[PDB]
Every structure is written in C-alpha cells, then in structure tokens.
Amino acid sequence: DIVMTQSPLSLPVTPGEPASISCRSSQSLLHTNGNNYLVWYLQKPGQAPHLLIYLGSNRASGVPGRFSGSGSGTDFTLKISRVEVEDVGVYYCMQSLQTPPTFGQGTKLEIKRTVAAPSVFIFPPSDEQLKSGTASVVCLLNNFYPREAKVQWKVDNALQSGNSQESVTEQDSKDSTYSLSSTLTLSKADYEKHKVYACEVTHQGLSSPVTKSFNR
C-alpha cells in the first residue's frame, strides 16, 4: 500500500490568516500523463468527508475559492488563503493512483479566537431519577475558549475524586467556542446524606475560580 503522512496533525489558525496542510506520499503520485493523483477532503464532525480538491490542484465545483491544492510527486499542500470560522473540521489527503486508496491521518483545524471564560450552571438530580437509586449532579461550562479547563466537585466542602466524568463538544462552527459537562454520580442514599453541592471551575479566562452550588 501507499502510505500517506500529513503534517501538522493539529493546526491552530487565527481567522483571516492563511493555513497550509502538508501531505507526503511513500511513492510518487506523478503519472506519465502529467497528472498528480492526490485528493483532499474536509470532514466536519458527525458528517461524511466532503471532496475539496482532486488531481492535486482541481477544485471541486462548488468548493469556495479560498481552498487550493498544489504539489507534485511525493509532496503536496492544501492551502486555505484566508481561514473562515466555518472551516473547522478534519482535513484528509488521499492518493488516487492505486487501490487500496489510502488516506493520511487527518489534520484537525482549530480556530484561534479570543479568550472566553465559561458561563457555569449546575443542575441538581430530579426526583424522576432518584426513585431508581442513582443521583446525577451536572455542571455545565458553556462557550469557552482555550479548551483547557478544570472542574472540581465539593460535597459539604469535601473534595471529590473518582466519581465524575467529563464530556467536551467539538469547536463551534460559528463562535469557535467549546462547552463541557461534568457529571457527578452518587447513590441516592449518599446524595441525601449531604447538603451543599458545588462545582468549582478554573480556566485561563477566569481571574479567579468560579463556584456554582446548591443546597439539596
């Protein structure tokens, strides 16, 4: 098989600036007919890949003009002349010379936007859940940038560990932010033995840690 290798695999770019993605092939994609057999796709989260460039430098009809492909032989580049916030996703190159068609590892384009601190919300367990024995306490961190963030759970001022799980969204295609949920899981019996439930958030955008809490 032909091995395709892309770089960088993570590409942070300020909107309005250019972005370049490199793709290298383990053997030449230049054909005696003069064409180079290399294609580029963009895969947006939860979608199938979408064809951008074929034959090395042909823009697929309907693809915005800011996308262009160049290169020859074993060395190829996808260039976005001026990146738009909707350009977030994973970019793949693929050789179109032989079967099996083989793909690069994928380059995730990330939009470098201004820092935004999370807005924090906390949700107590509902009676509809508690009647079957489990208590989920949910802490929401909404619309922040830097994706890096830390959530610590306190129960009657006692720091928790081992009983929470986080999930983070993909970067928003309009405002370039992330959101995060942290879910604390207790038995109903343990839940009703304590009063203060607090989610404590640290993030680059917060001059001090922010805490949201409730009493049962």
Add this chain to the structure above:
Amino acid sequence: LVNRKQLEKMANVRFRTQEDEYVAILDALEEYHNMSENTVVEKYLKLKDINSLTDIYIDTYKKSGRNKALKKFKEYLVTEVLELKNNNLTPVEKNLHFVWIGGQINDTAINYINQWKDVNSDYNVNVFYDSNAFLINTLKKTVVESAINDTLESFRENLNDPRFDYNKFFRKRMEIIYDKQKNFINYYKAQREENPELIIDDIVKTYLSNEYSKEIDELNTYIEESLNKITQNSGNDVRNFEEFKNGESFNLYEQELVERWNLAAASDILRISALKEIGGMYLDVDMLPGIQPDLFESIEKPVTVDFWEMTKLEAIMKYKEYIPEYTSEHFDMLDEEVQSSFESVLASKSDKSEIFSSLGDMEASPLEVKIAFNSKGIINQGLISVKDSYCSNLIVKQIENRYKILNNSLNPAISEDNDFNTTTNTFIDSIMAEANADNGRFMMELGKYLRVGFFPDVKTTINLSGPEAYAAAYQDLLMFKEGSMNIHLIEADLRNFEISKTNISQSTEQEMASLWSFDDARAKAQFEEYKRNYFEGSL
C-alpha cells in the same frame, strides 16, 4: 461552442464510470463559458488547456467509449478558435515595415517604397537596415567571384567541351566557397574576441583588404553613400532595436548575416520580430500598393489571372510614369482596341490616389498574423499583424526551434574543421538520426543548408525562416500546440490567414525578376557566362 450539459450528453457512454480526467474537461469547459470578460488571448489559452485535458483523457483511457465523442469535441474547439479570431478585431498599428540589409539600397526599391508612401500619408514607414553590415553583399560577391576563377583554374579536364557536365563546376566551387567562408568565419570570431569594439564592417574591410586587395577608401565611400541614402529614405537601424538584440533570434540573424551571407534569411528573421514588437504591415520592396478596384473593371479580361494583373501595372506605368524604366513587355504585346482602352481609362485620372488604393484603418485578431498568398501558396512577402499578436510569437518560436534543430547537428560537424564533403556527410548523418515520420521532409531539406545560395535546387531557407515556419505556426495555433513540423493543414485552413489581394499588388516587374530562382537552366547559363569571362582572363 457546446456548453457543459451538451458535452455531458455527447460524451455519455452507457455503463461508463465517471473519471476524474473526464470531470476535469467538464469543469474547464464550464470555466470557459464564464470567461465572457477575458481577453481573446486568455480565451485561446483556456481552449488550449481544454484541448490538452481532452488529450490526457484519451491517452489515459485508450479504449474508452468516450473517445469518439471527445475527438469530435476537439473539432469544435478548433471552430471556436476561428470564431474568436473572426469576431474580436483590434486596430492594426499604422506602420509599413521594409527591410534592406547588407548593402546599398538601390533606386528601384526606393521608387517602389515611394508609391506606398504617396498613397498612405497616414502611415509611418520604416526601412530597417544594419549600420554595422553594409559590406556583406560586397564580401559575398568578392569571395564567390574568386571561388569561380579558382574553380575554373583547378580543372584538369577540358572546360569548353560542349558536353561538359557543368554540375562538376558547381560541386567543385562549393568545396572552395566553403573553405573561403570557413576562413572568414574563423577570422571574424577571433577578431570579435580579441577586440569586442570592432563592428562587422570593420572586420570585413580589413579582411577584404588583406585577402582580396580591396581599397579601404572605396569601401568607406560605399558605406557613407549607403548610410546617407538609407537615412534619407526612412532608414531605421537594427543596431538600436533593443528587443531584437536581446532576444533569442539575434544570434540567428547574425548567423545568416555574417557566417552564411544569406541576406534573405536574415531579413526573414528580422521582419517577424519587427512586426511582433511594433505592429503594422511588413512588405518586400518589390511589392506595390493595391490597384483601385473599380479602375479597370470596365475592361474585360481576355492569358491568366496573374497575367491580367501584371498588365494592369504595366499600363499604369506606361501612361503615368510613376516608376521610370518600368517594363511594358506584357502590355506592349496586346490588341490595340484594349491596349488603347487602357490608355483611355488612365487619361480620365490625374491623381495617384485614383490609381492606387490606400490601406486606411485596418483591424485584425490579436491571435493572428495575416500573410500573402500567390499561386503556389503562402509567401511572406506581405504580412499584417497587431503588435504582440499571439501568432507573431508562434512564428518567432517556430524559427528559433528550427534553428535549434539545425544548429544541434550543424555546429558539432563544423567544429571538426574538416573539408566541405566531410562536414556535409557528418552533418547529414547527424540530422538523419533525428528524423522521424513527423519531421522527415523538414530534416531532408535541412541537410542542404550549407549549399543555400551557392548551388541549384536548394529549398532550405523556406523551411527554416520562410513560409513553412508560418504554416507551422498556424498549425500550432489551430492544434493547440507548439513545435509543428509536418503540416497537415490544407489550403482552406491556411486561407483563414490570407491578406486580401485588394491590399497588395504582387505581380510586379521586380517580383518576377525575384522568382526566377536557381534553376538548372540558370546554373547552365551562369556557367556559360563564367566560361566566357575565364577565356578572356577576366572575373
């Protein structure tokens, strides 16, 4: 030209999978139809890319069911080029370009040029000359004269035997001319190196004085009279033509001028560069203005189309006398009722502008160069082009490529410093090893290069710098390529580029004297002349 949807239907093949190389054609064709606001040359270049993409497909999928329809699409691309050519015209710059290099211009050329001046007062006129090289004709004439006498003296058999094979004379003389020319070339190359301030006429003057005992005084007078005569007749110096001097054709120009003494080939090279850089109309000095169309339209024509045209000029010149010493031969042998009918029509006119037409405001495609035709096909004695036209570039490149092929085999053969026969065999053998079906006829004519102008029945110049280079450039245009060798275009294709006969009188007395080429009858008549001088001890 078909749009994308129409090509999709035309090239639809049952059960054919779509190919990237096919979609590339479709995308490019759609881009073409969105180019309404681009220049004609940009549109041609897009058609060229569409043709190249179609060829890539056909070469990649040799057994594709699409290929029949795609070859028809390629025909449609050619038709669109002609549509572009015919529907987008721009003004032709009002310049008339003549060329007189390598010696003094003679009065008959001036008198012809003056006819164009007199009926085109809105046109600028250039007569390009080379201020460094007035002595080339003298050098060639002197060397050839001496080679003739050397050849006759060399014979160890009886010269005036009436059955003498005079081709023995031309073969031997060629061996001697080649040696003399080689000697001068080596002297010139050495002198140029040793003193880069010397111009050609400096080196020729010294060479002629030392080698042929010519008087430097008479050569200086000749140069001064030549310069004074040309600069009183719209002369413009090649040596100030910076675009020409700095391009890849200047060394080919000087190869012909200085090494081969072929002023016709040098003028071939210069004329199309002049046209490309300035625009206008190039004319050989034996061409005359078009005759006013309605002038002799009441006189019915009795011989041929060319003969009727020739006697039109002879009539004009007998009864108006614009050019003295113009012939009446083909006129002086007509019936009186029509001969005097010519005198009668001309008596009704008093101004030259009722005899000769004017060029006026002309326009042409930025793609094209228009060329004169005669009974034998295209001929570069007249050319029309807007400045920097696409074809003028294709023609310049055709000449440069043909010289590259020539010189790649010629220069190594000459470098061995062998005699003429040995050099020729090495050169021909090198040429033949690069011959194929596409270029064979051209390569065959290239093999005679060293004989040009010293030997009968040699057609090399026409294939190198002359009309074949134009036909090949037109083929380059219509077939979206460069480097055409063998010509597939038929006369109908080439006639897309004709200059209208209304704009030039080609059947002139001087033109006829210029197409009596180096025949076999000419070679025999020349030998008779040389023998006569030889048996009186003159040159």
